[PDB]
Amino acid sequence: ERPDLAWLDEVTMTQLERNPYEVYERLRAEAPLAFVPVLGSYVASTAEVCREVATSPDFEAVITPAGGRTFGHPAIIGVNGDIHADLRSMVEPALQPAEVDRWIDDLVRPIARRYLERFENDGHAELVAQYCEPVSVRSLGDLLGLQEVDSDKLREWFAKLNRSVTNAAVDENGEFANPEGFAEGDQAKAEIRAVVDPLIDKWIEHPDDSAISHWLHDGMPPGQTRDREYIYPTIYVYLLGAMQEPGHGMASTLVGLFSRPEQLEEVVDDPTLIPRAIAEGLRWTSPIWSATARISTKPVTIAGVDLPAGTPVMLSYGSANHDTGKYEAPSQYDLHRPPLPHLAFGAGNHACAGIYFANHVMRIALEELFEAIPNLERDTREGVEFWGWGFRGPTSLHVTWEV
Numbered sequence: 001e002r003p004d005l006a007w008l009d010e011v012t013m014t015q016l017e018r019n020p021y022e023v024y025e026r027l028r029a030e031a032p033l034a035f036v037p038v039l040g041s042y043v044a045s046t047a048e049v050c051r052e053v054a055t056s057p058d059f060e061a062v063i064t065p066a067g068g069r070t071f072g073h074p075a076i077i078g079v080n081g082d083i084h085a086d087l088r089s090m091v092e093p094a095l096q097p098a099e100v101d102r103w104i105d106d107l108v109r110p111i112a113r114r115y116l117e118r119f120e121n122d123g124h125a126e127l128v129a130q131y132c133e134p135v136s137v138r139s140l141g142d143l144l145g146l147q148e149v150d151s152d153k154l155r156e157w158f159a160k161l162n163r164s165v166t167n168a169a170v171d172e173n174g175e176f177a178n179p180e181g182f183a184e185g186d187q188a189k190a191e192i193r194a195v196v197d198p199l200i201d202k203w204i205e206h207p208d209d210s211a212i213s214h215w216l217h218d219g220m221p222p223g224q225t226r227d228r229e230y231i232y233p234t235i236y237v238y239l240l241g242a243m244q245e246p247g248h249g250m251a252s253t254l255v256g257l258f259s260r261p262e263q264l265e266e267v268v269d270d271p272t273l274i275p276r277a278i279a280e281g282l283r284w285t286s287p288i289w290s291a292t293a294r295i296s297t298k299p300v301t302i303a304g305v306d307l308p309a310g311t312p313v314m315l316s317y318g319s320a321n322h323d324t325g326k327y328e329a330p331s332q333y334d335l336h337r338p339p340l341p342h343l344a345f346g347a348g349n350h351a352c353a354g355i356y357f358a359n360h361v362m363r364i365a366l367e368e369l370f371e372a373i374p375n376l377e378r379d380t381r382e383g384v385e386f387w388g389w390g391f392r393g394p395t396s397l398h399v400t401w402e403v
């Protein structure tokens with residue numbers, strides 16, 4: 001429709017998944033709010049527009065089309081009003097900073113050690129599969145009450161949900177171009193139900209300290225629980241993003257550090273710099289790159305575009321975090337970048353609920369890794385490929401060290 005952006009008609013889903021940064025560099029200059037045909041939606045690409053939409057009184061949450069097809073209702077990310085308030089009150093207790101501080105070290109550090117012990121003497125490893133993902137899912141899985149679900153299984157589930165939720169491509173008529181791509185999301189949900197339904201059966205009668213048990217019981221009248229159909233979509237939200245993203249963030253941080261060997265040495269020497277390293281890692285390759293959205297509730301003008309009521313806008317926070325209006329040479333990882341606001345945790349009433357927890361998981365994981373393997377080196381025989389438009393991170397991270 002917009003004539004000067006006719007080139008967007010030729011952007012493909014595969015291109016965006018392999019590397020979205022060239023398209024979005026053009027969008028940030030040409031059209032900070034732009035309709036992207038293959039995505040079937042307006043996309044916000046700059047920090048100013050993403051923050052405005054995410055915080056505007058004239059927008060509310062909406063799930064992406066493929067997200068809705070996968071998760072259904074009421075996913076915490078796609079609802080508003082009283083239901084959203086209830087789901088936030090449901091998830092927030094275990095994520096409160098004073099609560100996290102009571103137990104985060106005893107949760108994550110033994111897990112990180114357990115996975116590290118399996119390879120720390122090998123001289124080689126693929127850190128995504130052998131460390132970053134397992135620590136992320138085992139930590140959250142235990143908190144949730146999924147101790148008996150193997151980390152291999154939790155990792156398979158968030159891979160399948162990832163592909164289903166980001167199966168966004170639409171055809172000439174605005175219909176999903178790849179409908180068969182939702183089948184593995186449906187199969188993941190069926191497997192999750194088979195595992196989690198018995199656990200919920202038990203928690204209803206025998207509550208414990210698991211987070212899901214508290215989701216069922218907290219704030220409810222005596223003898224009542226939240227219906228499982230009311231909480232399952234948020235369970236799925238967790239089994240995707242909350243399981244995947246801390247692993248993504250640690251891995252991207254390491255890749256960035258490896259790209260700046262002088263900076264990797266600083267952080268290994270001085271582990272108090274790990275939080276700063278992680279913050280730059282999240283800006284540099286945002287794990288949740290473009291997975292959430294808002295919808296206008298009345299006619300509104302954003303970045304010169306007159307939007308009718310009912311218009312969805314995807315928030316490409318990963319692009320916003322490369323806004324050259326804010327950052328110098330944003331495509332380069334720089335630990336010594338001045339600490340500035342970023343949008344990797346979103347903004348507004350639907351901003352990330354688990355920031356404090358996530359930052360500690362990533363921190364502890366990197367602390368233990370650098371303690372166990374101070375001479376870590378990237379395996380330069382294998383390149384690092386990043387994949388993902390909706391969620392983005394490295395597909396593998398081959399490293400070596402002198403044993």
Ligand code: HEM
Nearest residue numbers: 076077242245246249288292345346347350352353354358
């Ligand atoms: C580095 C790791 C993580 C990153 C980068 C991340 C980022 C985000 C982003 C971008 C959103 C959408 C915000 C928006 O639409 O404005 C979000 C939502 C959310 N995240 Fe995080 N997340 C991470 C880890 C986690 C973890 C571990 C948990 C739970 C233990 C969690 C819980 C949630 C919840 C519940 C929401 C939905 C909030 C709502 O819609 O009201 N996140 N996250």
Ligand SMILES: COc1cccc(CO)c1O
Nearest residue numbers: 067237238240241242291
């Ligand atoms: C915490 O998990 C998520 C956060 C934001 C988006 C999604 C899925 O679109 C998630 O699963």
